[model samples]
Structure formats: C-alpha cells, structure tokens
Target: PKSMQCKVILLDGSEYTCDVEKRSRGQVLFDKVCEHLNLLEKDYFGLTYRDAENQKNWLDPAKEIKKQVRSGAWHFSFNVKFYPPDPAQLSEDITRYYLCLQLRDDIVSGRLPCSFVTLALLGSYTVQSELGDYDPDECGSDYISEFRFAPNHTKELEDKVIELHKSHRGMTPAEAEMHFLENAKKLSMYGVDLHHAKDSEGVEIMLGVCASGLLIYRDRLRINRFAWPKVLKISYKRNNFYIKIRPGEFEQFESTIGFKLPNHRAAKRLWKVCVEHHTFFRLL
Candidate 1:
C-alpha cells in the first residue's frame, strides 16, 4: 500500500496535515475504466454503489445523488442580464418613464410583498433571464426578478439620495442632478426609480403613498401578524434611494406573499453568473 500526505490551508492561513492511502490497484483500474467511459465525474461516481457481495452497482440513483455525494466539489456556470437603459435602445429619459410605469404597476398589483433584498434579487434575475442565454443546470428553468421602493421621510429620503453621490461627486449642481436623474430613469426600467416625481413634488412622495397603501392593505387583508417579521424602512440622499427589509424575514415574507425563494444550489449558480458577467442584480 502506498501512503500520501495532504496539506490544506484554513481561512486564517493555518495549514492542516493529513495522511491518505493511495488508490489500490483494483480501485485505480476501476477509476480508469470509469474515465474511459466518461463516468468518473461526481455525477456519475455518485450514482455508483456496491452490492452486498461487494460488486459494483450503478443501476439507479436519486436526483440529488450528485449533490449529496459531491457536496462542495462541483462546478457551476451562470448567465446574467441587465434592465438599465442601453445606449443602443431608447434614450435615458424615456427609459426612466417606462421604469416608473412598471414600478407603479407592481405596487398596484401587490407584487412587492417580499423584503427589499428579495425584490432586488428578483429584479436582477428578471433582467438576466430576459437578456441572457438559458442554461437549465445553471440558472435553472425559472427566471428571477426584483425591485425596491422609494423612501418616505425627508431624513430617510436625503440619506437614500446620498448613496448615489459617489457617482456624481465633483459635478456641478445641474450636472449632478442630471446624472442622478439618468440613474433613476435607468433604475425605473426595472421597477424602482429614485428620481420619480408627481406634480413637481418628487417620486419620494409617491413612494410614501405606495408604502402607506401597503400598510393599509396589510391591515385590511388581516394578514397573519406572524407573516410580517417587522416593518420596512426607506432612505434617500444625494439623488439615490435605499430600502431596507427586516433581517431574517425573507423566507417568511416570500411565503406570505405567495412566492418561492430559490434553493441554495440555484442561488449559488446565479451568484456565479452574476459575478462572472458582472450582473447588477441578485435574487434572494
């Protein structure tokens, strides 16, 4: 029998030491045969088993066999899309208007029932699915989408606006306003616009109105008090908007809202795609 040494590094930079037995002749032979047959990967190996008499068996396996056997050792791929305005399409102003229209529809339709993080994730998924290629093993058969609401109070609104200041740090007042307006317009296309306004007041007012409507609906529907973990908050500053969902409430929120959260595997695959393609969204 041959012996082998294995070294592993921990997150803190500590090294781990271990010893493992090298593959036996029989096992090596089996491995070679599997490789030749294109069945050495986890998906195939996981399906393999041994009978009572110690004979190799691979007649059948459950759907999750690969996941169970491989655990953390698997490869993933992802496809992503964005809804923000593209120079090739309509101008930024028109895109902003369209985004506002979509956001209004979502509020009227009661679709923003989950946490803002979940909604943002959904929005990212929606754009990616519409714009990217479909890969069942990666992003799965379903598409994703997300959105966020505008802020309410002036303090909150100002804070939300400030998040966008980085994008316009040194520009003149008019330029800064224009930059934020364009950003809001692009975001609107995906159902959340920070710069929306009505009767010259601004989109924040509408956001407050929508939020109030949601509260009223929550009360009227007499939704299970348990369904809502806590209230949501919003902030705006420097022309950007930020919405915060209560912690640890995404799963319950989705269930209450009649939506499903993607499983861990699906989330991992989508995250991989988002990182690879530099996609601007995620689904929770």
Candidate 2:
C-alpha cells in the first residue's frame, strides 16, 4: 500500500501534513501527529471523522489504517470528545481558541443547525474570538462584510453579537470564549457525525459506534443499543454480517442478528468499521 498524504487539522483551523503508510496502525499516525504538533496530552484528544458512508469514526490507534479506512488523502481533526474537567481553567488560550474556531466552522458549514436562537448565541462567540471585546461602535460597524457568510447571515450574526455584548455584565474576552466552549461541547453532534444504513426489514437505521457500543436509531430516535459486553462476536462473509449476541435477560432476541448488504464492497466496509470500532473502543 502506498503512503497517503494526509492533513491533520487542529481545532484552530491550523493543520500539519504527514505521509501515512496505508498499513500503518492508526496509533502510529496519531503518534506522528502528536509529535508534529508537540502535544503531550494524547489522552485528552482524539482523531474523528465522518466517512463517505456518513459513519463517524475515531481512528483506532491499535488497528492498521488499511483495514480501518480506504487509502486516499484524509483529513483528521483532533478534538476533545468527552469533556475533560481536570483542566478547568485552561491556561492555554491556543487550545481554548482552537475549539472556538471549530465551533465557528461547524456553525458556518451548516453541520450544526443554525436556528435563529442557536445562531444568535453561537454568533456571539465567533465575534468574540475574532474581534475581542464587543465595542458598541465596532458591533454597529459593518465589520463582518468580508467574512465567508451570506449577507443576511452576516447581519444576523452581527446583530446577535451586539445583543450578547449588551448583557456582558462582567465577562471578558477570555471568559466569553471559555463559556462558549462549555456550551458548544454539550451539543449532541459535537464531535459526532450521523451514519445512515438499513436493517434486514429494509427499515432505515442510523448507526453510531463508540466506547460503550453500537447505537441504532430510527429517524433520529434511538431504538436499539448493543454494548460491547453483550456482543460475543462479529464476522462478515461475502455480503453477510453476523453479530453473535450473548444471551442475557436484559436482552432477549436472536443469538445472532444477520444483516445482508447489497454488495460485497459495502459489506466489507461495514466489516472494517466494526473491526476498527472494536479495537479502538476496546482499548478504552
């Protein structure tokens, strides 16, 4: 397998490039990235992505990249998935600001719903990050005209920023950024991406794999959960996926949930995803 040129992006919009071997363990690439960025807190951050299948995966440092992902140019973003309270007062503004920048991108990209109310609250932080304290005159000025936003959106954002400033009883620039992150991290989709798939009954299902286990959803509503412990085995042959379930009172169903994918490629893709998830989450 050829070494793929990949860009590891930071929460700050800043990124570094690296050539990762196709067979390199996800852990190796992560170490390289940490070395490149010189970040010592490896346990604090994770590499997350939304695959073409819309599956959200965190690179499993223990699994080979080839088995976990296809070979191609990849973009990896490092961020905190589970909130870490140990570092409550972040002395590193660079880190705090990095998360703010990501939130701005998420909002602007429409990845997160930008309802008027949500937009207003989030818009305030974007401005605070860029322009510091909200000056009445600056807030009123046409300062956001040059940003990558729709004209109407620019106005809405600007108006909201000023509105937030109006009630800034005692919060400073740093205070605002910190508060913004605390709220932003709580969003359901924060560091998360929704994946789409269909079960045996041709029923639409959304899948999410995490440390706890696999989550199956129906139209955004969770209908099933398969934790790692209850799962005895997972294997794929041809286009058949078999999840050997452990019998338990908490869960009473078929010992195996067999899923047949439409094609071999899709089946293999899901297989690889499951393999990677098992390894990554098992480590945790």
Candidate 3:
C-alpha cells in the first residue's frame, strides 16, 4: 500500500505539501483538529461562535500574534546623546574672569581672607609709574610709617595731615606733605607702629615693617576663612606693591566646582598681583 500525502495551508495563504508520516502526524493533527473544532461548534457555550461578535472576539488571539510578529520584524533605531554646556566650546578668558569675580566677592564679604592679598597686589598697578617718586629713605624704612606717623609725637599725626589737607584744599607738594605727615602720626596710634630702630651694626629692624603692618591688619579683619598667617610674607624689592595668590588658594576655588585643580604646581607659582594699593587700604 502507498502512504497518504497531506497538504497544509498556512494563515498567510502559503501551502506546504508533505507525506503523512509518523514524524509529521502531531503537527498535522493539531491543524486539522483546530479546523474541525472551528466548524463543529455552532454555539455550544451559548456564545454564538459563528456570529460577527463571536468571530471578532475569537480573532483577538490571532491579531495579537500578528502584532508581535510585526513588531519583531521592525529594526530598532537609536539617537545620539550629548552633554549640556559643551566644554570644548567654552572660553578660557570668560572662565578666568568668572573665577576672579568669585574671588573678589568672597574677599569683600570676608568669606575668604587670603584673597585680600591678591586684591592689594592688583590694586597697586592702577596707578602707573607713580611709586618711584615716593623715596624709600625720606618716607622712612616702611611705607606705612610715611603715611601713618608724624615728624613729632606731640600731636595726632593723621589728624594733622587731614587738617593740613583741609587748610590747603588743593595745595602744592610742600603743603600736601605737611598735612600728610600730621595724618601719619594719628594713624600710628592705631597700632600702625612703623618705628625703624637701627642697631650699632646698622641692622634696620623696620625694613618691611609697612608690609608687615598691612598683613597684621589683614589678619585682624576677622576674615573667617582659611587662616594663612605663616604664608603671609612682605617684600619691597619690586618698585610696586602687589599681592600674590598662592597655589593652595586655588584649591579653595576648585572646591566651588566640586573638582580638584588641573595643575597644582604651576597654579601655585602664578602670581596674581594688585593694581591699586590705596583702594585696598580704603577698604581696610
């Protein structure tokens, strides 16, 4: 006897013709069983199996299967991502200016003390070439002495200087000097001691006394931030007065950005000098 051959019809209208063998029996039987089941049941469960509503509900399983297949067939697409505030496009000058502003505000508000030196150094440069006229000898060993003490201790130095300025509102060099001397004496009483005591060996004690006085005043200003007394040193070697911001100071700045500074050694040595000294003294 010859073996029977069967034809299988797929949901997509394709057909597969194969020999009816034991190996293919289970799949063939499942398809045939489903087809017969679809015909025999008229409304056995009182659900009207042949009705439009019944067919609609029964078709959901097929629809869901088709949907899943369609979804799988489609390719996945992706989008490129980017970060905000592109670092590559940022301006270095703008960043430096912003940092300077932050440091300036912090110093003014007393949030940062060491920054005061940076301000003073920068302030000295506001006036050009005027520092050389002030003699280091006649002005005394320290600049503070020239501005805060008087020729004689009998009167208030700063007061006398102010009075002289008042007497000759717009006076000549000699008149201005006389008034300035008076103000210097008054300023001395406020602990601005610029007394240059010389020993027999000619060792001048008040060599950098003015600079030291400035530092002492800076310390007493209740800066409340990082205490940097040891690092605070004064010098008069250069013609102009200026303040240098130490490298350790940049660390405090980096804290604002939640990161460490890129170069520790180089940043430390970079001196940010002041351009105006009188402005800084006025602030003090």
Using lDDT as the measure, the top candidate is 2
Cα lDDT tens digits, model 1, 30-148, are 33333433332221121233333333223222233232223232111110022333322334433333233334344334532333433333333333323333233433223222223
- 126 Cα displacement, candidate 1 (Å): 23
Q: lDDT values of the candidates?
A: 0.30, 0.64, 0.26
lDDT digits (tens) for residues 1-284 of candidate 3: 33344443432224545443333323233344334334222111111012221211111111222232222211111100111112222233222222222223333344333222233332221111113233325433232322212112223333333332333433444333233223222322221212222222333232112212222222233321212332333222222222323446536422210111123321221111111122222233
TM-scores for candidates 1 onward, in order:
0.18, 0.64, 0.15
- Point out the higher-scoring one by lDDT: 1 or 2: 2
Clashes per candidate, residues 3 or more apart or on different chains: 34, 1, 29
Indicate which candidate wins on TM-score.
Answer: 2
- Arranged by TM-score with the best first, the candidates are 2, 1, 3
| Local accuracy of candidate 2 as per-residue lDDT tens digits, 240-271 | 76778888876666487766666665666667
Query: Which model is ahead, 1 or 3, in terms of TM-score?
Result: 1
Model 1 residue 151 lDDT? 24
lDDT of 2 at 150: 21
Deviation of model 1 at 214, angstroms: 25
How far residue 127's Cα lies from its native spot in candidate 1, in Å, is: 26
**Model 3 stretches with alpha carbons more than 4 Å out:** 1-91, 115-117, 125-284
